[PDB]
């Protein structure tokens, strides 16, 4: 009696750098997995493919051997590995006389942009330009960073550090 | 009945540094691959040859063993590994009085040249010299880089950083 085909996850997808986890919920004397990049395993819970890249995309196939020595039919999961946005570049107005608007911007294209304040505050915007008024809690000098997200929800590496200089206005002289 | 010869990809080609992926779409009890640099594999989807170099160029051969124990005839894919342009050198006019034309150039030969602005903007040209007028959005001071592309579409390593200095014109004195 040919065994039942194994229960394997539905098609999925990860971003370059994340982990591809394969598993089955069925019970067998032995399991037989095969796939892209030479992947192979003889267990229910194969070693996780870390730092997954585009060469790990493809079709992962499983069959099992039951207690009566018979092999089951096949089932597969298609796994894809999407892209990471190009590390964005952050251009700050840097030198700014206190009271002048602080304008942080990029040239990167993205679904959304995450700006990181020197104190760690993060403001999420849909556009390139972040305009910070002088009475805002984000009107901070120091080291600023940008992370961008694409259509698939993949996040970029953080940008290099842009620096902002907010200068004091000299006091009314005697 | 000798099995059918396997389905293997058409001749291809990669640039030095890219990945050589081999595969077959046929079904066998076992697969037998052999090739350049000592390459060997016994699966449909052999481990990918990463950072491919010129020693990986050559003829990759596949035969398979079917369920009746018979071996198939042979089929091959020829794989070549092309060249990478020599890392180009970028010479910038550096010190420039605002209003003077900014002229970035190289000595490298290429099919096309990609110039990278300090803010990340990239302008693609067919020649050595990029001439940026003073009213252009690219008239930027700071760190500039060049990447070149050859006839086969191979991209160079980025050049070292050239620096540009745009100087201010002093104000009309009292």
Coordinates of N, CA and C in Angstrom, one line a residue, chain A residues 35-39 55 59 89 91 107, chain B residues 19 43 45-48 118-121:
Chain A
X35 N 17.1 19.5 -3.3 CA 16.8 20.7 -3.9 C 17.9 21.6 -4.4
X36 N 17.7 22.8 -4.6 CA 18.6 23.8 -5.2 C 19.9 23.9 -4.4
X37 N 20.9 24.3 -5.1 CA 22.3 24.4 -4.6 C 22.8 23.2 -4.0
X38 N 22.2 22.0 -4.3 CA 22.8 20.8 -3.8 C 22.2 20.4 -2.5
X39 N 21.1 21.1 -2.0 CA 20.5 20.8 -0.8 C 20.0 19.3 -0.7
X55 N 20.7 31.7 -5.2 CA 21.0 30.4 -5.7 C 20.2 29.4 -4.8
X59 N 12.8 24.6 -6.4 CA 11.9 23.7 -5.9 C 12.5 22.7 -5.0
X89 N 21.7 56.4 0.0 CA 22.6 57.4 0.5 C 21.8 58.6 1.0
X91 N 21.7 62.4 2.3 CA 22.3 63.8 2.2 C 21.6 64.7 3.1
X107 N 18.1 59.8 -2.7 CA 17.9 59.6 -4.1 C 17.4 58.2 -4.4
Chain B
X19 N 28.0 33.4 -10.7 CA 27.7 32.0 -10.4 C 27.4 31.2 -11.6
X43 N 23.6 14.8 -8.5 CA 22.2 15.2 -8.4 C 21.8 16.1 -9.6
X45 N 20.5 19.0 -9.4 CA 20.8 20.4 -9.0 C 22.2 20.5 -8.3
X46 N 23.3 20.4 -9.0 CA 24.6 20.4 -8.4 C 24.9 21.7 -7.6
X47 N 25.8 21.6 -6.7 CA 26.2 22.8 -5.9 C 26.7 23.8 -6.9
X48 N 26.2 25.0 -6.7 CA 26.6 26.2 -7.6 C 28.0 26.6 -7.4
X118 N 28.3 62.0 -5.4 CA 28.3 61.9 -4.0 C 26.9 61.5 -3.4
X119 N 25.8 62.0 -4.0 CA 24.5 61.7 -3.4 C 23.9 60.4 -4.0
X120 N 24.7 59.6 -4.8 CA 24.2 58.4 -5.3 C 23.7 58.4 -6.7
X121 N 23.5 59.6 -7.3 CA 22.9 59.7 -8.7 C 23.9 59.1 -9.7

